[PDB]
Design a protein around this ligand. Structure first.
Ligand code: RE
Ligand code: RE
Ligand code: RE
Ligand code: RE
Ligand code: RE
Ligand code: RE
Lengths: 116, 115, 116, 115
């Protein structure tokens, strides 16, 4: 699995479940094309977005929509969208883990890149 | 100032200097319209983005051009930008400070509101 | 596995391998007793520190020593020690993941707590 | 000031006020000896910890009493403290700023050095 997304709640110390994840890939005409999507599991993780065959070199956008997570906590969120943009596999295939840490007034995102 | 941005470099233990910062405000059509931009100072800070009365209630996005910052230091980073979205509500005069902590593969952004 | 430690390098975007991890448990006489130890794997993770049977309620210290990781990168570290102190299983058994993110001038640590 | 500490609360979007901060310096016997302590102000900052000439080269530890801070807000946090260790080298006059970003289950600490 070359692309994994994890979402965690820094206030609760908990995985963020049912967060919608969208992955886009920049096309030849400089438009964002859809690439993959899913929802985070009970562990706050989403695997199986792509395979090494499909996950070619390129510029990718990963966007999360946390509305359902906040709703289920009885929270009315001020805003519920985060996105990072990165270049993938530019030095050959890698496995990527993108982790987001959520809080009402702060956001952190970390990438871990390994050679498989 | 009602709005300030502060940017730190975790690799060098220093303010992030001359980093470009763009502020957008969500318009009625749900598009991000330009609001203000600037570059961080020698102390990593950016002031003078808006007056009190132009800084109206709404949804703002701060977009920090971290890719160009790291490449100027000879580092190939992960992210294209560091970003934060925050809501400005209608209140008495409040100060908004956006603080960003940058590394090549990780960042954190925080919105601090003071009276 | 109720206690996991992960260590990552925010400059390289890499797991931190061969980081020594020491876990202590506060004793009746208010001294730190040894509890478990290990070294992080190639994935920057250490599992198998303890079992649910041994990992009782208590006050625990987790300390890492990164000297070997910095050495292997050809880095002469200014300092190479980090520690957190936490109370475990106070509301019944939990699984704990303690993650550290390393950089020359910054340190971050995050705890993820799940009910198994 | 040569040494300042700044502490932010990520849950409330505010400076962390009245937080106790202890600074230690490693002694010859490799023990942490007390160096200075204080509480953060209404802006989350702590100055006046040391004079320039008392802030000698060495290895310093800053220990922020986050457990009591969160419990005063009715929150049971994970960590006992937020900590950072930094080395002060012998240089020309330098400013050291320790910045801490606090949440109940996560924190980050950064040492920023300026001339
Ligand atoms: Re990005
Ligand atoms: Re993300
Ligand atoms: Re906000
Ligand atoms: Re701690
Ligand atoms: Re740790
Ligand atoms: Re340092």
């Amino acid at each position: 699995c070359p692309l994994m997304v994890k979402v965690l709640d820094a206030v609760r110390g908990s995985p963020a479940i049912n967060v919608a994840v969208h992955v886009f890939r920049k096309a030849a005409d400089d438009t964002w094309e859809p690439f993959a999507s899913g929802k985070t599991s009970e562990s706050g993780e989403l695997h199986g977005l792509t395979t090494e065959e499909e996950f070619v070199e390129g510029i990718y956008k990963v966007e999360i929509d946390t509305k359902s997570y906040w709703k289920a906590l009885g929270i009315s969120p001020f805003h519920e969208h985060a996105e990072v943009v990165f270049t993938a596999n530019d030095s050959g295939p890698r496995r990527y883990t993108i982790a987001a840490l959520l809080s009402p007034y702060s956001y952190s995102t970390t990438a871990v890149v390994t050679n498989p």
